[PDB]
């Protein structure tokens, strides 16, 4: 009736929003485990007597290198602009080659399972937010363990060959160094946490148990019944924070690395394509386009499968070891520490000069009853995992989300803060609240560092009615008030919620604006086109404020419960 | 009906046969010893601590004594030594990918003994490795047997 | 016990377990045993009352 008079698709202001990248980075620990098993049940039905090259822990580190390969060649060849990691990658002859022998290359059925999950997305009203799979987020200290180096494997392939009689013979697998860390000798034993000292010791995690048969030379008979074998004379290299590139550690792109890795590359996709029957190659595939990658699994504190203490060289046999004397080398799940008192306050002699409730210093009264979990097997290796899915609300679709690596572990936010729209500001900045779910990295405690983790748990939701809280004027900070003398009325002592007796030990604040936040995310954005620093990157702790609460969440199990290794 | 609700330790425990002495068996089997009674190390293997004493193989098979270590072969550990003597170990090691149970030994009183998680391996350092155990066994029988 | 060793003694030569890195004779001596001592937990707890 008054639709022409209103006419209201011609009286609108309309905006979508901005460019934003959100950037995707796979734990490969679940897809190695997921190939090593793969490989685990298939391997005995292949001929490999035409092949030097060709073991378990080969054929392993190759879908592991096509997984890393996949994420660059989409990084360089689909992001729009490509990340300063793959920028550093030159075009010359020797690069071209190896960047045309992974694109050619034969991969089985099985991968493109996992890899279908990391494929491009842009969402439809937000036409100009993009989810795309890179790691030029990535930083060592930060996503070193969680991103498993194919180089690991060959040295597993060299361990397999050997003609020792020994029990466990994995114990020298975990001792051949990775990575120079510009100091530091990063071992197998660091990456994969099956190997600690505090005398060294072995300690069987669900990853190291997975990887410990590709390097075990008890079946090294069977790894021989060829005419012909070569070992991999693998070089390690030696970087910094200012030489870092994952891309050219991952890929194993050094100048002293790339005719192996040319080899490697050629010998194993051969093999994949007259044994395990791979018909198909990436380069058709780094273009396509689906709404899998918005699926990611969420985990609550769960105990490392690494450990960044330094390792001397194994010269005796090792122990066995367990799980509290892992957690104490790999700093997980600390107690409360004890206060040292070497500040004090200035508390006045005399009590009835100062309004003492207005007075943040105590008589020394209340203690915290702040204390964090302490390390525990079944609250660190058994929780449970949600399943979190923007689209639909199905668990068959699943299947590939938790093999895949999309993740994000949380232990101890517990709130994000959503920025209401203002309808009178502009339409651009309303439509591009993109940042709001996510925590800057220098807030974020890194986990391949030498930082302890303790954890203070999160408040338990059992309570009777739903809660939530709400900031006015300002959410980019929270206000402490500081009175005048003279004031208008009695200020009711309420609203303040206090934290009573810090020392030090427990935390002061719980909040955190724009070292404390314990996180992990595969859901990034960093902020410019240059190296990632600290000052640039953001982890995001949920997706729930882009895609609302109205998207499936279900729970399930880890995937060393629904995966059983035999 | 059948329950073990009534098990006591030191009534009814060599009468129970432990599953964890033929993982301790699968250990010895496989390794590559040319040494004439290899079921021995078996024997030697401790499988439970019972609140202050060391209760082996053989405590609880009756082969291996000492009053100078000696073996006598009863009915029961004539039978069991043929699947812990590494003389063919050649037939088991004749496979790609071999791997060891990395088995862990429960200390238990009368106050924590249960023997449901003993007999069936539900320590909670010893849980990944049983149901690695049952589900890659299940599967051998399901293909094979 | 004695029944399933015999069992596996006269059974097992007929077997491919190259597919496997646990089996072995002992290992299913013990799958068996381990089945048993099963079939009381499960009549335990889901047959007897209490």
Redesign the interface.
Known sequence: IFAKEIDLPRNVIQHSGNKFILDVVPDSRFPTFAITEFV??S??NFTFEQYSYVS?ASLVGYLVYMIHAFVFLVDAFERSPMSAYASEIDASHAYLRIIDAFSDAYIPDFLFEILDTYLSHRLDIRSKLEMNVSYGSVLYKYDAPRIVAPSIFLLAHNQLISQS?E??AYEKWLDSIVIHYSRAVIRVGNLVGGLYQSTHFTY?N?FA?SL???A?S??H???LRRPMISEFDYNIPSVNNNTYNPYVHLLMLEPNNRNITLDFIRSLSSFCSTELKATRTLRDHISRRSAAISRCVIKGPEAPTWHSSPLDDLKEKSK?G??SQFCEVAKFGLPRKENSESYTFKFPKDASTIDTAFYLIQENGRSSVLDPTTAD??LHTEGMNLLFDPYDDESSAHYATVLSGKLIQNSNIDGETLLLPDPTTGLARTNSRYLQGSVLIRNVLPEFDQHEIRLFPRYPQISRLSASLTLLFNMRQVWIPRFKQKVDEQPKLSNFSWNEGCDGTVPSLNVVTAQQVILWSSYRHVSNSDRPTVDTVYYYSTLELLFGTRSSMMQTYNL??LL???
């Open positions: 685990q049940r391997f005995s378990p009689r029990s466990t069987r669900w148990r410990s048969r590709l075990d008890a079946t008979r069977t790894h066995q367990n799980f097997e079944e060393h419960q059983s290794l035999h």
